[PDB]
Amino acid sequence: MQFSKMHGLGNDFVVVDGVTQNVFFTPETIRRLANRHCGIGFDQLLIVEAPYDPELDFHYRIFNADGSEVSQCGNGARCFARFVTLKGLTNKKDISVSTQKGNMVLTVKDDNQIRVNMGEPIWEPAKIPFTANKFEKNYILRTDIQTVLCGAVSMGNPHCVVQVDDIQTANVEQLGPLLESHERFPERVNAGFMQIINKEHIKLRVYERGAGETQACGSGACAAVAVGIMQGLLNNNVQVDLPGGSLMIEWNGVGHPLYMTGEATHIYDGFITL
């Protein structure tokens, strides 16, 4: 198996061309390869596949370090765009991709950043998925040590966004794991902790489903901003500062796609026998 190693703000990926290779594996193999000392080392593994809808350019699959397959990853989408460009799978400036859920568009900007059309955020609890009687802007999640309030939203993956007073002292280390597998999120959830600096600027930490606290989560940045906009606490264009760097999120509201712009970097190429 040929692969490439990439990162987006220090959220690191194995990216595989599954167009010119026949790529498949077990979750055990994913977990072995994710290990940083005895494997390759990654937060997620991404596959570029031929599209099912031949009008699109590619299909996009995402696997967490724990071996789980999921339907979204924003930092990965930016790396996907850089990968297919660098490796000559396409030279289009606007690249259309499917996932297990919805479609996206990856735009390779002249400054080399990638702007991703992530699709429209999803609010309906059953679709997140999230167990709730009714849609609300804030939901109560009881944990063993604290009851917290969150907004809940899907970007193709589930997010619970908790607002915090101070990002450095937020109890991500204990609350993250308790929220990630909270009973009300039947497919688990990415737990984001958001400090609002002003209506155009937040700081964010994300305890990811399947990966723990990474250096950056693009979909989590998207979700945090969507939630703050829904709650009337943020404006439509927001700088999000994650441990590994910043992203720009733009969302004009319900009915509109959400856009995420930031860096993506190729590191090295590899070969491994699975």
Ligand X SMILES: *C[C@](N)(CCC[C@H](N)C(=O)O)C(=O)O
Catalytic residues: 73, 217
The CB-of-1 to ligand X minimum distance in angstroms stands at 20
The helix/strand/coil state of 229 is: helix
Name which of 34, 95, 93 is nearest 60 in CA terms: 95
Residue 176 is a binding residue for ligand X (CB under 6 A): no
Q: How far is CA 203 from CA 41, 58, 206, in A?
A: 27, 33, 10
Q: Residue 257 corresponds to which tokens in the numbers above?
A: 């796609």
Is 219 annotated as a binding-site member?
Answer: yes
* Spatial distance between the Cα atoms of 59 and 100, rounded to a whole number of angstroms: 8
**Structure tokens belonging to residue 224:** 């945090």
Binding residues for ligand X restricted to 10-49, rule: CB under 6 A = 11, 44
Question: Could you give the angle at the alpha carbon of 139 between the alpha carbons of 185 and 178, nearest 5°?
Answer: 45
Provide the minimum distance between the beta carbon of 263 and ligand X in the complex, in angstroms, as a whole number.
12
Closest approach, Cβ 189 to ligand X, in A, equals: 8
Do residues 267 and 11 make contact, with C-beta atoms less than 8 angstroms apart? no
Which one of residues 75, 85, 163, 195 is an interface residue with ligand X (CB under 6 A)?
A: 75
Binding mask 187-206 toward ligand X (x if CB under 6 A, else -) reads: ---x----------------
**Which residue lies nearer to ligand X by CB, 65 or 141?**
65
**Could you list the residues that contact ligand X (CB under 6 A)?**
11, 44, 62, 64, 70, 73-76, 157, 190, 208-211, 214, 217-219
